[PDB]
Design a protein around this ligand. Structure first.
Ligand SMILES: [Mg+2]
Ligand SMILES: [Mg+2]
Ligand SMILES: [Mg+2]
Ligand SMILES: [Mg+2]
Ligand SMILES: [Mg+2]
Ligand SMILES: [Mg+2]
Ligand SMILES: [Mg+2]
Ligand SMILES: [Mg+2]
Ligand SMILES: [Mg+2]
Ligand SMILES: [Mg+2]
Ligand SMILES: [Mg+2]
Ligand SMILES: [Mg+2]
Ligand SMILES: [Mg+2]
Ligand SMILES: [Mg+2]
Ligand SMILES: [Mg+2]
Ligand SMILES: [Mg+2]
Ligand SMILES: [Mg+2]
Ligand SMILES: [Mg+2]
Ligand SMILES: [Mg+2]
Ligand SMILES: [Mg+2]
Ligand SMILES: [Mg+2]
Ligand SMILES: [Mg+2]
Ligand SMILES: [Mg+2]
Ligand SMILES: [Mg+2]
Ligand SMILES: [Mg+2]
Ligand SMILES: [Mg+2]
Ligand SMILES: [Mg+2]
Ligand SMILES: [Mg+2]
Ligand SMILES: [Mg+2]
Ligand SMILES: [Mg+2]
Ligand SMILES: [Mg+2]
Ligand SMILES: [Mg+2]
Ligand SMILES: [Mg+2]
Ligand SMILES: [Mg+2]
Ligand SMILES: [Mg+2]
Ligand SMILES: [Mg+2]
Ligand SMILES: [Mg+2]
Ligand SMILES: [Mg+2]
Ligand SMILES: [Mg+2]
Ligand SMILES: [Mg+2]
Ligand SMILES: [Mg+2]
Ligand SMILES: [Mg+2]
Ligand SMILES: [Mg+2]
Lengths: 262, 205, 151, 64
RNA sequence: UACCUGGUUGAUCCUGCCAGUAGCAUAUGCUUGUCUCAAAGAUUAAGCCAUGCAUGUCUAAGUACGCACGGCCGGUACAGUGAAACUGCGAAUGGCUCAUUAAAUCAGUUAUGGUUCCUUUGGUCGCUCGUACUUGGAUAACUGUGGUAAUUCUAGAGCUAAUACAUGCCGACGGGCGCUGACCCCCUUCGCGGGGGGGAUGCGUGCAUUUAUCAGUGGUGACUCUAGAUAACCUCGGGCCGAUCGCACGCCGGCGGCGACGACCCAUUCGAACGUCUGCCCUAUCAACUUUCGAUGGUAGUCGCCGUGCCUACCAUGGUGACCACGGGUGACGGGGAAUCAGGGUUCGAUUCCGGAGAGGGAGCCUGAGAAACGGCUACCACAUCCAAGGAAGGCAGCAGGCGCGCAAAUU
RNA sequence: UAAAGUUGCUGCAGUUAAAAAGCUCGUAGUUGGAUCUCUCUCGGCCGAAGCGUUUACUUUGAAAAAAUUAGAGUGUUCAAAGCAGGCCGCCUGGAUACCGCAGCUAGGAAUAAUGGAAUAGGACCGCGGUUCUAUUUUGUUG
RNA sequence: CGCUACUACCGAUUGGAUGGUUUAGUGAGGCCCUCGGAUCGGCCCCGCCGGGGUGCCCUGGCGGAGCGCUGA
C-alpha cells in the first residue's frame, strides 16, 4: 500500500469502543493526535455512542461546530479527535466535565468529575532530554513537551498539569507503595499499590501490583501509570474502584441487585 | 533504473531467488558524482522525504583542519595523489572520501607566523618584504613579547611538515563526501599517518 | 604485530594520535591511547581488547557496533574466513501428529573479534545481535567458552 | 465488503441409518403423542438435548 | 451415538477389495404456498470489451473591476450573492482480482543505539550585533483574431491580481562573549626582572550544515547519545530568522485582544522500510550446488533515507548440503479461519478481516511527505478505435452491462 | 470427510493370503545398564549482588486484533440471529475461556542429557614475591 | 494362429505448433553528465528625456546600436 491508510474497518476497530456489527462497514478512524489510535476514544464515539447526545454522525458534527466541546480546556471541532487516558472533556453549555478513566473491564467509562477537578490532569513522563543551550525538557504520554521541569522528575514519574497554564504543579515519583493504574494488557483498568519492580536489562521490566482486596497481578513497566502518592489517589476513581470482580462474584452482585429491585 | 535491492542477489546457499515484486522507488540508486577538480559546480538532488542532497561535480576549495595546532582554514585543492580504492580515481583526479589530496599551505603558514612569531617554510634568501618583517619581528610591550617568547618554547613542527611547507603544498585526507554534501573537507596529514601515506605514494611511483 | 596491511591507514577513529608532544615528554612513544567500550548485559571486556593494538571496526568492544536484541549460543564449526566464523545451532522441532521431536540445525556466520584468540573448532560462543555487518552476518561473538576436554 | 452477518446454524442432525424399525417407531410415537409436523422437529429437540449433554459431560470431567 | 451391512464357496472360517451408509460443497433434474436472514462470472479465459457512471473540493478568514445578479451613495479604494480562472489540498485511500510468488509471502516474537515521515498535537519562532506607513516582473480568468477532418488540441494580440513567482529591510541593539592588544595603572623587587589589573583599535559570534579538536548538564545494559568549549565552513541547482488574511474594537502623542494561514528544527501521532528468532506442500526417474558476468568474507569508497556485495577496486577462498542443499512441480497468494471428527486425525481456505502482489505483457519516469501510480506520463510487444490517409486516441482483475469460455454465477 | 485399525502416532500387516534385503561389515540416524540425600558483600531482619554447569521437562506470570469457535446475560412473538435492553428521568450490559510452535518470566528438581581433580594445566587458608596502576597524603596551595 | 474393438508403446518421419531460458549482435525511451544557445530579459550607451537642486542629474518613459557586461 502506497502512502498512509485513511479508513478503518468496523470489525477492525478496537474492541473497547463497543461498536456493533450491523450499523456499517466502517469505523470513525481517529485522527492523528496526542494519543495512539488503538488506545484512544474518538470524540464521535464518546458523544454519540456513550452519552447519547447525538443519534448520527451529522448530529455530532453539528454539536462540535458550535464550539461546545473542550478537550483539556481547548475547543476541539474535529469529530475524530483522539481523546485518551486522563483527558478532561468539558461541556459548558450543559455544564458537565468528564475524565477519560479506564474501567475495570478495560473500557473508557463515562466518569463525571467536579469542575474544580477539571482544572488539572495527570501525565506520565515518557522521556527527559537536554537541548538548546542546556535547557531540560520533559515529554509526557499526552505528547506535550515541557521545558524547565523540576530536576527531581525522572522517567516513569507522574506530573500534575494545570490545564489553564500547562505547567507542572507537583509530581509523584515512581516507587513501591504508590498507587497506580494499568493502562494496557490483560490487567488494563486495574488499580493497586506497586509492590515490586524487577529489571531485565535489554528487555521489558515487570511490575507487580497488589489490589486493595489483596489480589496481585503483574504488568510491563510501560503499562503502569502512577495515580497517587501512597494509598490515596490524586484523582477521583470511577464507580468500580479499580478492583476486578471474578465472574462468580459479579453474577452474585447482579442477582442481589435483581432481588433488591422492586 | 539503478537498483539497490537485496532480492536480485543469490541466497547464502547459492540458490537463485525469484522476485516477488517489481522494482520499487525506495530501492533506487543514482549515478555517481565523480567530483573533479575545477571551478565550483554543484547540483542539488531532491531525495526521499523532500529533503536535498548536494551533488558536487567540480570543486577547487575545501575546509581543512590542522589537528595538532587546531587551525582550520579554507584552502585551495590542488591535486589528487593517492586513492586507497582505485588507481583510476587518482588518474582522473576524482575527489571522494578518504582520498589523499595536496592542499595549499599559505593560510596555515600565515596563521603560524601570526601566532608564534617564527618563520615557517621560508628559503634562506631572507627577503622578508615589509608587512611580513612586521608580522615576524614587530615591536611589542614587555607583556606581549613575554607571551610570544613563552609560545616559542613549544612551537616545533615535525620535519616532514616543514619540508611540505617549504614546497608550499601539504598532504591532507578528505573526511567529507563530496557527492553527498557538496563539500570537500578534511584534515592535514601528520604523524604516523603521514609517514604511511608518504611511503605508499613513493612505492606507487 | 604490524597492523597496516591494507591500502588505507587503519586507525581507531575516536582516538587522536597526532597530539603535539614536547621533546621533554618524548620517552620513546606516547603509548597510543586505546578506545574501548563496555558492552552491557554483564559481559566483561577482554583484557586483549583493552591492551591490544588490532584495528577492527566491527569489534563489539573497540569498533562501532551496538549489541541489541537477541543473545544466542552456538558451537564453532568453521574458521576459514577473515575475522568471521561459522557456528552451528542445534535444536529439536516438535511434530504434533506423532508427539515426537526431530533434530534440526542451522549455521550462522558471526563476526569474531581479534580479542578472542585460541578459538578452536568445538568451543561454545555466546553471540549477540547487531546491525547487518555483511550480506549474511548479523551477530557478533561476545563470549567464548572452551570445550569440555580442553588442555 | 458489506454490513451483513453470516453466522447461522443447523438446528438438527440427520440419523446415520435411514431405515431401522426401532428408531422410526420411536420417532412416530413422539410425533403422534406431541402433534409434531415431521421428524425434523424430533431431530431438532434431539439436537438441543445432545448439545446440553455434551456440555454437561465436558463439565463433569473438570475438577469440582 | 467410540455402529456397520451385501458380494468369491457345494457349504465354512479368513484375507481383501468392490458396493452400500451419513455429512459437506459445486452442477443439474423434477417440484415449490407464507415468512426472516442470506452466497452469487473464483474454478475454464490475470481472455476481449460498445455505452454510461465510479474524485473532487470555499470558509468570516489567499486572489473578484464577469452588472451574471444586486446596490445603498452614488467619486465614499473594496457593500453583499457570486460563475470562471489563478493558488492550496486530495487524487498513493477506497474498490477489484489471485497471475506471479516455495524461507519468498505470511504468522508469532524482537530491532532500528541504522532510517524516512504530509498531517494532528506540544515545544521553539526579538537568543543572530549586521521603500519598511509595504518593493518587482509576469500570467490566467476576461476582451478580441485564428488553425486543424478530428481530442479535456491549442497560437498570436490587448488588459489585470496573490499566501502563485520573486526581491528585500527596519527593530530587539545597549551590549555581551571569544580572540587581538596601541596604550595606561598597581605591585613587588635598588633595579633588572617578576606578578596583577584596566583598556582603544581590529576579526568572529544564534539555531540548522560539513570537518577537526578539547573537557566531562542529563541519560542508557550498552553511544562514537544529549548538552558544553574551541578553529573554521556554510552549496547561485541558496536554510530559519512572517512584505499574508478575518472579526471586534479600543485605550494613551504610541501601544494592544481574539483568531486564520505560513514556517527551520525537536518531540508526538499515522505509518512505512529494512533487519533478528522459529515455522511451509509434492518430488532423488533432481546428489552435489554457488564462484570467470559477487558466489562467502576483509579493507577503502560509490550510491542510497540509512545498516549491508547494494555496486566498484584490491585482497582472501570461501559459503550450502542425506538434519535433503541445488533443481523441478503445484488444480500454491499466506494467515485469522472452514467441513468432518470418540481420542488421534484427514481435507479445504480464489471469497467481505490482516498482510502481499497486479492493473493486457515487460521496461523507464514526472510530481509529490508518500507511487516505479497505470480511472498519471514515455517507449517497445500483443490487440484494437476514428481518419478527409496528413494525423489522433487507447487499457472494466471498479459499478452495471456485452462477447467468448464453459457443467458453472444477478440490474446497463 | 467419517465409515478406513483399508496408511495404523494413538493403532495395521510380512511361515502358507501382498510382504524379511542372499549373507556379513559399516558412516550418518535412532536407542542405550546400576550408581551421587545458595552464600560473601552494599543500602534501609529484609531489599540488593552474583551463579548453582547448562538445559530439556512441569507449573505460574506477562505479552499476545477483531470476526469465527466455546460460553455468561438478554422472551427477535420463538428460532437462526442481534447486542441489546429494564423500571416508574432513573437502572444496567456490551463478560469470560481458548489462542500450537518459537521467543520472554519465576518456582520444582523426579526423569533425561552435560560438566566439574588422575601430566594436579586441584580447592581453601595464610604467606612471601614480580609488574603496572587508580586514587589517601594535604584550609588551601603546593 | 484366425475374427472385431479399444488403450498404450517404439516411433522412420530427420515433425510441427505453442511457450520458456540463454550466446552474439542491434537497440526505442526515460534518467544522469559534458556541451549547445533559438529566444526573453536586466545594467550600460546614446536620439528621447518629467521634475527635484538648479543651463544643473536622479530618477519616469520611449527608439537605436554595441558577439559591451551579465541573468534566465
Ligand atoms: Mg488499496
Ligand atoms: Mg530495548
Ligand atoms: Mg523534510
Ligand atoms: Mg476361490
Ligand atoms: Mg454361490
Ligand atoms: Mg464406499
Ligand atoms: Mg442415498
Ligand atoms: Mg407477502
Ligand atoms: Mg467476484
Ligand atoms: Mg476469470
Ligand atoms: Mg485547481
Ligand atoms: Mg491537509
Ligand atoms: Mg497529493
Ligand atoms: Mg506545530
Ligand atoms: Mg498575453
Ligand atoms: Mg563500508
Ligand atoms: Mg565489504
Ligand atoms: Mg568486484
Ligand atoms: Mg496460481
Ligand atoms: Mg494453502
Ligand atoms: Mg483465497
Ligand atoms: Mg485459481
Ligand atoms: Mg485484501
Ligand atoms: Mg501497484
Ligand atoms: Mg483483461
Ligand atoms: Mg506502471
Ligand atoms: Mg479502469
Ligand atoms: Mg488506482
Ligand atoms: Mg464489469
Ligand atoms: Mg454457452
Ligand atoms: Mg449456480
Ligand atoms: Mg477417508
Ligand atoms: Mg475410526
Ligand atoms: Mg490389512
Ligand atoms: Mg506370499
Ligand atoms: Mg532371510
Ligand atoms: Mg552408525
Ligand atoms: Mg540410565
Ligand atoms: Mg482471535
Ligand atoms: Mg455464540
Ligand atoms: Mg509459550
Ligand atoms: Mg545485449
Ligand atoms: Mg539512452
Amino acid at each position: 500500500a502506497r502512502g498512509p491508510k485513511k479508513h478503518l474497518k468496523r470489525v477492525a476497530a478496537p474492541k473497547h469502543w463497543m461498536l456493533d456489527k450491523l450499523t456499517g462497514v466502517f469505523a470513525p478512524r481517529p485522527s492523528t493526535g496526542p494519543h495512539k489510535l488503538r488506545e484512544c476514544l474518538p470524540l464521535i464515539i464518546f458523544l454519540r455512542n456513550r452519552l447519547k447526545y447525538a443519534l448520527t454522525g451529522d448530529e455530532v458534527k453539528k454539536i462540535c461546530m458550535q464550539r461546545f466541546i473542550k478537550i483539556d480546556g481547548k475547543v476541539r471541532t474535529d469529530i475524530t479527535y483522539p481523546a485518551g487516558f486522563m483527558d478532561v472533556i468539558s461541556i459548558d453549555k450543559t455544564g458537565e466535565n468528564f475524565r477519560l478513566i479506564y474501567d475495570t473491564k478495560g473500557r473508557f467509562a463515562v466518569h463525571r468529575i467536579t469542575p474544580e477537578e477539571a482544572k488539572y490532569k495527570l501525565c506520565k513522563v515518557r522521556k527527559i532530554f537536554v537541548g538548546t543551550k542546556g535547557i531540560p525538557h520533559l515529554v509526557t504520554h499526552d505528547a506535550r513537551t515541557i521545558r524547565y521541569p523540576d530536576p527531581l522528575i525522572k522517567v516513569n514519574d507522574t506530573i500534575q498539569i494545570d490545564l489553564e497554564t500547562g505547567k507542572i504543579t507537583d509530581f509523584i515519583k515512581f516507587d513501591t507503595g504508590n498507587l497506580c493504574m494499568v493502562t494496557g494488557g490483560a490487567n488494563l483498568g486495574r488499580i493497586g499499590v506497586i509492590t515490586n519492580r524487577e529489571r531485565h536489562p535489554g528487555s521489558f521490566d515487570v511490575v507487580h501490583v497488589k489490589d486493595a482486596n489483596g489480589n496481585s497481578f503483574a504488568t510491563r513497566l510501560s503499562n503502569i501509570f502512577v495515580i497517587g502518592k501512597g494509598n490515596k489517589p490524586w484523582i477521583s476513581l470511577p464507580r468500580g474502584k479499580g478492583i476486578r470482580l471474578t465472574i462468580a462474584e459479579e453474577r452474585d452482585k447482579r442477582l442481589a441487585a435483581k432481588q433488591s429491585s422492586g | 533504473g539503478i537498483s539497490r535491492d537485496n532480492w536480485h542477489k543469490r541466497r547464502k546457499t547459492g540458490g537463485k531467488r525469484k522476485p516477488y515484486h517489481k522494482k520499487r522507488k525506495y530501492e533506487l540508486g543514482r549515478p555517481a558524482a565523480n567530483t573533479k577538480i575545477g571551478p565550483r559546480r554543484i547540483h542539488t538532488v531532491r531525495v526521499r522525504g523532500g529533503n536535498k542532497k548536494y551533488r558536487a561535480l567540480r570543486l577547487d576549495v575545501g575546509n581543512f583542519s590542522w589537528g595538532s595546532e587546531c587551525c582550520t582554514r579554507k584552502t585551495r585543492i590542488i591535486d589528487v595523489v593517492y586513492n586507497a580504492s582505485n588507481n583510476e580515481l587518482v588518474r582522473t583526479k576524482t575527489l571522494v572520501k578518504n582520498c589523499i589530496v595536496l592542499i595549499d599551505s599559505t593560510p596555515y603558514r600565515q596563521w603560524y607566523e601570526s601566532h608564534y612569531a617564527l618563520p615557517l617554510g621560508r628559503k634562506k634568501g631572507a627577503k622578508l618584504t615589509p608587512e611580513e618583517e612586521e608580522i615576524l619581528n614587530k615591536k611589542r610591550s614587555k607583556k606581549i613579547q613575554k607571551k610570544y617568547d613563552e609560545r616559542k618554547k613549544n612551537a616545533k613542527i615535525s620535519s616532514l611538515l616543514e619540508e611540505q611547507f617549504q614546497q608550499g603544498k601539504l598532504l591532507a585526507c578528505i573526511a567529507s563526501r563530496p557527492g553527498q554534501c557538496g563539500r570537500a573537507d578534511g584534515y592535514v596529514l601528520e604523524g604516523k599517518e603521514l609517514e604511511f601515506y608518504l611511503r605508499k605514494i613513493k612505492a606507487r611511483k | 604485530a604490524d597492523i597496516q596491511t591494507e591500502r588505507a591507514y587503519q586507525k581507531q577513529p575516536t582516538i587522536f594520535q597526532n597530539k603535539k608532544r614536547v621533546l621533554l615528554g618524548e620517552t620513546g612513544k606516547e603509548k597510543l591511547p586505546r578506545y574501548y567500550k563496555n558492552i552491557g548485559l554483564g559481559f566483561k571486556t577482554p583484557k586483549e581488547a583493552i591492551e591490544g593494538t588490532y584495528i577492527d571496526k566491527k569489534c563489539p568492544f573497540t569498533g562501532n557496533v551496538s549489541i541489541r536484541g537477541r543473545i544466542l549460543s552456538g558451537v564453532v564449526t568453521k574458521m576459514k574466513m577473515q575475522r568471521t566464523i561459522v557456528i552451528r545451532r542445534d535444536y529439536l522441532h516438535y511434530i504434533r501428529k506423532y508427539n515426537r521431536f526431530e533434530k534440526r540445525h542451522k549455521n550462522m556466520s558471526v563476526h569474531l573479534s581479534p580479542c578472542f584468540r585460541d578459538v578452536q573448532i568445538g568451543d561454545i560462543v555466546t553471540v549477540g545481535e547487531c546491525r547487518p555487518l555483511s550480506k549474511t552476518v548479523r551477530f557478533n561473538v561476545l563470549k567464548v567458552t572452551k570445550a569440555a576436554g580442553t588442555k | 465488503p458489506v454490513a451483513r452477518s453470516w453466522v447461522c446454524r443447523k438446528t438438527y442432525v440427520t440419523p446415520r441409518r435411514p431405515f431401522e424399525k426401532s428408531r422410526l417407531d420411536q420417532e412416530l410415537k413422539l410425533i403422534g403423542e406431541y402433534g409434531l409436523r415431521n421428524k425434523r422437529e424430533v431431530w431438532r429437540v434431539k439436537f438441543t438435548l445432545a448439545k446440553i449433554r455434551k456440555a454437561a459431560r465436558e463439565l463433569l470431567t473438570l475438577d469440582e
